[PDB]
Specification:
The structure is cut from a larger assembly and holds 1 copy of chain A, 2 copies of chain B and 2 copies of chain C.
Chain A (H helix, E strand, L loop, with lengths): L24
Chain B lengths: L1 E8 L3 E5 L5 E4 L10 E4 L3 E5 L5 E6 L11 E4 L6 E5 L24 E5 L5 E5 L4 E6 L9 E4 L6 E4 L5 E3 L3 H4 L5 E3 L6 E6 L12 E7 L3 E7 L6 E7 L4 E6 L5 E6 L2 E6 L1 E3 L5 E3 L13 E2 L2 E2 L9 E2 L1 E4 L3 E6 L5 E6 L3 E6 L5 E6 L6 E9 L21 E4 L8 H12 L5
Chain C lengths: L4 H6 L6 H10 L15 H13 L5 H15 L1 H24 L10 H16 L6 H4 L4 H15 L3 H14 L8 H12 L8 H13 L6 H11 L2 H11 L5 H7 L23 H16 L6 E4 H11 L7 H26 L11 H9 L12 H4 L4 H17 L8 H12 L3 E2 L13 E2 L3 H16 L6 H20 L5 H12 L9 H7 L7 H6 L10
Antiparallel strand pairs in C: 2-3
The chains are: A little secondary structure, B mainly beta, C mainly alpha.
Protein name (chain D): Pre-rRNA-processing protein RIX1
GO molecular function (chain D): chromatin binding
Function (chain D): Component of the RIX1 complex required for processing of ITS2 sequences from 35S pre-rRNA and the nucleoplasmic transit of the pre-60S ribosomal subunits. Regulates pre-60S association of the critical remodeling factor MDN1.
């Protein structure tokens, strides 16, 4: 609800794909 | 990109990234100390051995990292603690922006190191020169040292229950600024806010202090004066260690019989949310509230609800750059990577080759040294040449500008 | 105490660099304005300077004019006593040295000589304008004879003379009158030339001086509307190849528009001769810019709807073999002369023309090159040529959003521009169509001075729009990856990226979670005080009393 | 296919003017002429046509040919990797033909830009080929053995153009430069022993940098550095013939303690000594000119990158800069051997502060580079800046502001130096008397990077210590008045005054009457984002405060 | 401070200063309004004349021009032009020209007929014939040109978005009063780009009710705009006529019959505590908080027509019903100076040829404007640059 607080869902920042490695 | 974990047990030296499942066991490492390791200048890692009176030096820059000891550094005395004062504000060339790349040889200014019996050794690292030795600062020990702003202030904590704030210019050229006796038993750890400014007159910098008194003391640092605490908490268990969120949104405390969490923006039962830590600059009252912690199994009684995460007998904690994962070191010599919200372990790192996790560190990353002088002190000489080893680093080195040059050039010819 | 100015004068007839610069440096001091050296010692220095200028080896002249400039600038008494005589001597040497020009420029020091003489005359007559009593009887009997020499010299050296005549024409509009035709001739002879051997500065100066020529309420309007009416023949000449009336709302506007230049010829068997069309439109746009963006001693009628319609029809011009290849390059350059005109109509007038700030943003979508086949996809190979133009586009958008501000509704041009800017932020390679065992060395790496422009554009986008998901997540990934890369390469993060992360934290828009704690993890040993306030907020600003 | 028929461009290069030649250049930039099979029929026609432009012409075909050669080498790897050697050899052949006769092309009044275009094109073709390894080995370097001495002799007359090219060649192709170094050295020494004031700062910088980079062939850097550092003690001792250093006998002992080394260097001691007769009062400027000449070479030896570390003696440099600031008339009186003369004493009073300003310049470059590695005496270099501040002839801290107006350029560096120092130190220092004088200096001088530096200085002062009331309200009135002036005269206020106002507002100095209503109403409409957070946080905060 | 002060009665108007005893009366003036005058630029001063259907325009003496109009109009406002004294292409500052004017002229009459003119070339740009169904008491530009607020005797506040007012369909409508709205003020701060995400609107009517609104949802695009939430409201004893603020905003000064009263927003409770009331319903009294009430203080006893704060947050300007204005001081509640001429319709203060208008709307067509750009400041420095310039030329000379 507030962007600047710890959210209430487990894996935030999974939709930025920082730590994923794409397979080629 | 990914994060990189550098943790070491009493007989093991593992290094491993969080999302790689690949790791490198450093061959020779021995520690019985809480915070004895440090990463130096993005090219080196220093570890203070125990019962050998020397520091091991590992080179961690390679694509295939050096498993072995790159170098040794003997010392006058076996010493427990370490800290580095990183040099900053030299690569921009503020006079005119050229944005210098890093040199292949880079080093910090100082190497803080402290031993048993409270003695403090500080060394210039570009040239090994023991600028100053304080014979006694704490009167039983030191357990942690940290430079909170870039090189401006350093904070020390020992087993005399006194946490001391120095000033680096008044320590290297001693009479510290302020001393903190609010605990009664040995202070085992502290942490400071990752978000910081350039000064202390216009920031409210939070210092969390943790001991075997089963208390957590949050001090507001803004001087120009002495710091004022604004809250202290209390625990049934003997608390051991602590880390924060990267924005001072929560606290995560490591202790015997589990690791516990605590929200600092505490949410009440009216959809009302209370900030425990509110403060200002130097104008601030001294009425530090008291609260008590109790596990999960509304706060005007003097109680707060901490949420149990784990049951492991943790020794040390660290946090990821996201602020969503905890890396906790148990007493069986293995690290658990856990998620804060679901309280579900995602990964378990062990060492391969045993004691507990002595220390651990994390920082994100993308895909010879002088000898130290044993008892020698650079005095008030002026004819002495304070020689150091240094390297500067190259600067970073369109078409419409070329055509404009051409257009200006063409006028000079009459042909 | 006092440095005995006679000593400076006697050591001046011979003085090389490390003495002459000290002579000039110590003559700045204000203690040479003081009683009873004002008629016997300054006279000595001035007679020395005059003997240096009146006859010399062309080193004493350079030295002398620089000396007189410094002396008259830092001492008003030398001005009020002897500025007319100094300026007369300097003009006399200028006159003899421009009576010939092809025997004085023969040694690589005639150019500098004209530079110093012209600059010195300009500096003297730029300090004698703050004194009405002195602008009389030292300049006005002399401008009649100064100005034709400068005009004759401007035929060969327009880069150096034209600002002087511009300032003189501007501050004196009644002594430049009987020479005005003689000026106009040379300016049409400098525009009838190729007009690309001249620099942008020189082109702008000839346009500005031709504009100020018409100061002599109404003549400015006649010249302005003449240049505005010389646009439509060129567009109709371009309409015989693009086949208008495929879209008729454009052709209704083209015929809704309202002289010394040659009517040009085009040949299709020589397609390079089609480069005359942009090179005329840029000329007329520069002249229009001159008539519009310049100051005046009176207000002026400026048609804004007319030029907005002109810019609107310019960016409508878009979509045997090599001719089609040449037609695929002139048209972006044609559209860019609408971009270049709206950029000047926006900043100089500001909120006048607020009515047009929403059509421009929709019409910028026409400038983007699309793929040819049917699609709405971006043609990145054409975009690689157009880098400067898209930087100008970004500055235009930032100019507009300073006045408009945050916008409720979103538009599609901004997402395509973000895709463009993210393509341009990638390190170019020009071996992709195909090695010699190393294809990573043939790249053109992007400076920080370009990343600053891109990041300012993304700041403008994140401030004033609730963007869609994917054109936000791309921005965040870009900022994080590049910031970490630079913090590894360097030991720090440049300021534009910090401003980008600040805007990404403050203005998340449609997101449900901020990027705050990651920005602080990157800003570990590079501290900053924005996020201190965010995390550790302060007491309000009036509670203290 | 939408190709522009490259053979038609090559057909038009030979005869072209600006309005078409520039479009010809812009078309060769297209990344579509990089197919392999085009390399035999039409790119060869382009290359041989350009070579016809180079190999013969009227000094306009040469310009056209070198420019289009640069453009078609930068944007075609095929053309480069095939014919870059040929193009480079052609333009170097013309440059060798031209450098033989410098005097006769300079009396044509286009030769200077001709050499500029030639040298720039050669430099670009060099720096394109240097980091490609196969195109370097036996395709760049056997031409360098001919290219170095041709550029050496041309540096004598046109040094601004060449010396960066030689600097890059020396830094990259160092071993190939080994035979020419003495041949280069005796060119640089003649420019230095010559007037050295016909050169601007850029060319002086390049001269010092190249003279440093000769010493690359761990240790020779140190020998050249200490050799230059040894040539200050004679000059400072020659300043003792003007004013006595025997008074304090603390600056004297430090002058004795400076480095000198003898009969171990005759290859970098090449400079004449100074006569300095006190009957010519305009001949004393040789001293600070010499000191600038030494300091430029010194900071070139310090402040340049190398592929190795340096044993740089910071302690000696701090001792030297402390010595240079000791030169003054406020504590040390004039010598009695010299007799009083008003013109002589005038030039003495005006020439001493330049001698101090050189030490300030060296400290600036010592703190810009090497920040927080000489921290052990940063307090001392703050103490000695007070010696720079001029006083009247009564030592009761009466400042003479008439001379301070002559030192605005020099005081800008002082404020920048102080801002760079205080960004490394804490807030407990013993320098408040120096700050109180510097504020008075700045407030005199204000009534344009000047504003930025002094405003950052005021921000450092107001974020470090609680100042007394009178300087504080002076600063407040300054910021308020200047911001009002710019916003009534123009539409905006810059960022520096904005941050100054914010620092003023958040300061515990709160009892002033203009801080509360005026410093905030200007910020309420300025469009700054940092002030928005103070008025509207982005995080929960209590409605009630205990303060 | 030493600001100049303006005021106009129904019979006359004048201009004076706070720290001087010099006064300039105006020859021809006749007014009935709360807001019928405004300065355009730094040069000119517009006043809407009563019973004549035209504007009088004065320089900062005598009527310079007279602007005929289609109708007798009640309220005036102007949208200033900014971003023109500094070129973001060249980096040069520009002086103000001799002819400078704002973009717009917003005029209003009874029955809600909102006229929108362009002043550079007099053009009837837009007309809203019914916007309130009643008269208009005050119209204002909250931000630079972003939004236009207008209140009327229909007990409604309307928020028009300016850019889609000139090319209709307003953005937010606020009906939370039962009686005519008399006054309203705004407290704002601005980001790098100007918008409303922290701005606060204070609204004041004959209901004896002060109402405070937060405008941070207005750009959300759910009328057009998502409605705001009222954060606080107060209930006064008396029928209230004007409100002014502190510029740091710390205090609300309310002008009514029987003197002008003062509320502290940072309310000081017992001990050491302060509470901010603008992060609820309250009931005011004259001269501790959880009762539901707040304590005001009174500064005057006279009937009030208009109010204005000084720039230095310490002096009120209260224009009474007897044709004179009192210069007060807050800490003492004492008078320094009383200005009279030789009630008050309007009052304002600030520190130190025109086209005739049209009567038919503007519907390519050469939308002209009169304009003047103004010179740079370099036509109204360092020696070391000149010294480098003459140094580098020495090397060109050799014999």
């Amino acid at each position: 609800r507030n962007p600047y607080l710890i959210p209430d869902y487990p894996q935030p920042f999974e939709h930025l794909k920082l730590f994923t490695r794409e397979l080629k | 990109m990914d994060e990189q974990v550098i943790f070491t047990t009493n007989t093991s030296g593992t290094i491993a990234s969080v999302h790689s499942f690949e790791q490198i066991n450093l061959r020779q490492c021995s520690t019985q100390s809480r915070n004895s390791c440090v990463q130096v200048g993005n090219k080196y890692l220093f570890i203070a051995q125990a019962q050998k009176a020397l520091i091991n030096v590992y080179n961690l820059s390679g694509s295939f990292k050096r498993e072995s000891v790159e170098q040794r550094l003997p010392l006058p005395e076996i010493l427990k603690c370490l800290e580095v004062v990183e040099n900053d504000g030299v690569q921009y060339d503020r006079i005119q922006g050229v944005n210098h790349n890093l040199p292949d040889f880079n080093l910090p200014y100082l190497l803080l190191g402290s031993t048993e019996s409270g003695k403090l050794y500080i060394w210039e690292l570009n040239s090994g020169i023991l600028l100053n030795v304080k014979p006694m600062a704490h009167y039983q020990s030191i357990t942690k040292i940290k430079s909170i702003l870039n090189g401006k202030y350093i904070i020390t904590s020992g087993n005399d229950s006194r946490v001391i704030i120095w000033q680096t210019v008044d320590l290297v050229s001693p009479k510290p600024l302020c001393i903190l006796h609010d605990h009664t038993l040995p202070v085992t750890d502290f942490q400071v806010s990752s978000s910081q400014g350039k000064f202390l007159s216009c920031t409210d910098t939070k210092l969390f202090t943790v001991s075997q008194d089963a208390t957590i003391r949050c001090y507001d640092l803004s001087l120009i004066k002495t710091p004022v605490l604004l809250a202290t908490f209390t625990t049934p268990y003997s608390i051991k260690s602590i880390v924060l969120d990267p924005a001072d949104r929560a606290c995560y405390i490591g202790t015997a019989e589990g690791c516990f969490s605590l929200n600092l923006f505490y949410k009440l039962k009216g959809n009302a949310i209370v900030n425990l830590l509110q403060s200002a600059g130097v104008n601030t009252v001294q009425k530090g509230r008291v609260f008590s912690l109790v596990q999960r199994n509304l706060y005007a009684m003097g109680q707060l609800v901490c949420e149990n995460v784990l049951n492991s007998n943790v020794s040390c904690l660290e946090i990821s750059m996201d602020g969503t994962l905890l890396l906790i070191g148990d007493t069986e010599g293995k690290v658990s990577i856990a998620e804060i919200y679901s309280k579900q372990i995602i990964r378990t790192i062990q060492t391969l080759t045993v004691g507990e996790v002595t220390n651990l560190l994390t920082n994100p990353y993308r895909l010879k040294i002088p000898n130290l002088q044993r008892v020698i002190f650079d005095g008030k000489n002026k004819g002495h040449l304070h020689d150091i080893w240094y390297q500067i680093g190259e600067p970073e080195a369109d078409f419409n500008a070329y055509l404009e040059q051409v257009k200006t050039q063409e006028s000079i010819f009459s042909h | 105490e006092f440095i005995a100015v006679s000593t400076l004068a006697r050591n001046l007839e011979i003085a090389k660099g490390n003495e002459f610069h000290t002579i000039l440096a110590t003559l700045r001091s204000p203690v040479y304005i003081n009683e009873q050296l004002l008629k016997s010692e300054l006279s000595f220095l001035v007679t020395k300077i005059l003997k240096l200028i009146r006859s010399g080896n062309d080193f004493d002249l350079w030295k002398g004019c620089h000396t007189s400039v410094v002396t008259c600038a830092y001492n008003p008494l030398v001005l009020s006593t002897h500025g007319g005589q100094l300026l007369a001597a300097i003009y006399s040497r200028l006159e003899q040295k421009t009576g010939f020009y092809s025997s004085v420029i023969s040694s690589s020091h005639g150019k500098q000589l004209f530079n110093t003489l012209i600059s010195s005359v300009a500096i003297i007559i730029d300090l004698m304008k703050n004194k009405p009593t002195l602008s009389r009887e030292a300049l006005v009997p002399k401008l009649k004879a100064i100005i034709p020499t400068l005009i004759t010299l401007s035929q060969y050296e327009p880069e150096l003379v034209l600002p002087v005549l511009q300032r003189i024409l501007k501050r004196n509009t009644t002594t430049f009158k009987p020479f005005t035709n003689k000026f106009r001739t040379v300016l049409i002879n400098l525009i009838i030339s190729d007009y690309a051997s001249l620099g942008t500065k020189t082109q702008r100066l000839v346009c500005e001086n031709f504009a100020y020529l018409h100061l002599l309420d109404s003549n400015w309007r006649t010249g302005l509307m003449s240049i505005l009416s010389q646009f439509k023949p060129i567009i109709q000449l371009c309409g015989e190849i693009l086949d208008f009336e495929q879209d008729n709302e454009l052709y209704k506007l083209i015929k809704s528009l309202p002289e010394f230049l040659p009517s040009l010829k085009l040949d299709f068997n020589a397609p390079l001769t089609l480069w005359e069309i942009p090179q005329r439109l840029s000329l007329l746009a520069d002249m229009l810019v001159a008539f519009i963006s310049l100051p005046t001693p009176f207000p002026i009628r400026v048609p804004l709807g007319g030029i907005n319609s002109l810019c609107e029809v310019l960016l409508g011009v878009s979509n045997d073999n090599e001719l089609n290849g040449v037609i695929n390059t002139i048209l972006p350059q044609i559209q860019f002369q609408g971009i270049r005109l709206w950029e000047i109509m926006v900043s100089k007038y500001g909120k006048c023309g607020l009515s047009f700030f929403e059509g421009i943003l929709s019409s910028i979508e026409l400038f983007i090159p699309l793929k040819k086949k049917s699609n709405n996809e971006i043609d990145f190979n054409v975009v690689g040529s157009l880098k400067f133009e898209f930087a100008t586009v970004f500055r235009l958008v930032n100019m507009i959003l300073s006045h408009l501000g945050h916008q409720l509704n979103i538009i599609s041009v901004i997402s395509q521009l973000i895709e463009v800017a993210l393509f341009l932020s990638h390190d170019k390679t020009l071996i992709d169509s195909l090695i010699y065992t190393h294809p990573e060395l043939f790249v053109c790496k992007n400076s920080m001075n370009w990343f600053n422009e891109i990041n300012d554009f993304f700041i403008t986008a994140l401030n004033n729009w609730i963007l869609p998901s994917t054109p936000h997540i791309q921005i965040l990934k870009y900022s994080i990856t590049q910031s970490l890369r630079l913090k590894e390469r360097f030991g720090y993060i440049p300021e534009s990226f910090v401003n980008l992360l600040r805007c990404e934290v403050l203005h998340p828009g449609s997101e449900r979670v901020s990027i705050l704690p990651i920005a602080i993890s990157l800003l570990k040993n590079i501290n900053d005080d924005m996020f201190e306030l965010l995390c550790h907020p302060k007491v309000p600003v009036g509670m203290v009393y």
